Amino acid sequence: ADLANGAKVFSGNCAACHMGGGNVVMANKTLKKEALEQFGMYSEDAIIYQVQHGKNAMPAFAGRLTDEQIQDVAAYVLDQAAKGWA
Ligand code: HEC
């Protein structure tokens, strides 16, 4: 997908809580590869579903982000997780 648009969606909607791929709200639910894989979330469609619907203290973005923005940011997250979030 568009990784330039994902990074920008992410800086605008996700980084308050996940800067650097971590998680200041629930410290074990990070965006690193091994963590996503432990929970069955290392997939484009798992991330899209959770971005759209929310989960516990993760807000829902259905209706605040377009389908394209959500697709982009899911792709960005997966790209970064692959690279270790350097
Ligand atoms: C804080 C207010 C957050 C914002 C803004 C976003 N997310 Fe988040 N995320 C948050 C929590 C509390 C959790 C855990 C929820 C639970 O109880 O299970 C998460 C989880 C995720 C995950 C899965 C992480 C994992 O299983 O290891 C992903 C993939 C994720 N969040 C991505 C994400 C994106 C792309 C966001 C912007 C659109 C975003 N989050 C916002 C907290 C918060």
- Domain locations in the chain as residue ranges: 1-86
| Coil vs helix vs strand at 40 | coil
For residue 81, the CA-to-ligand 1 centroid distance in Å is 14
For residue 1, the CA-to-ligand 1 centroid distance in Å is 20
Which ligand 1 atom sits closest to the C-alpha of 36?
27
Burial of residue 18 (number of CB atoms within 10 Å: 0-12, 13-18, 19+): buried
Q: How was this structure determined?
A: X-ray
For 62, the token pair is 């259905």
Which ligand 1 atom sits closest to the C-alpha of 56?
17
Rounded Cα–Cα distance for residues 2 and 23 (Å): 24
Burial of residue 17 (number of CB atoms within 10 Å: 0-12, 13-18, 19+): middle
Rounded Cα–Cα distance for residues 29 and 27 (Å): 6
Rounded Cα–Cα distance for residues 60 and 32 (Å): 21
Q: Å resolution of this model?
A: 2.2
Residue whose CA is closest, atom 41 of ligand 1? 14
The fold adopted by the segment(s) 1-86 is Cytochrome Bc1 Complex; Chain D, domain 2 (1.10.760)
Rounded Cα–Cα distance for residues 74 and 68 (Å): 10
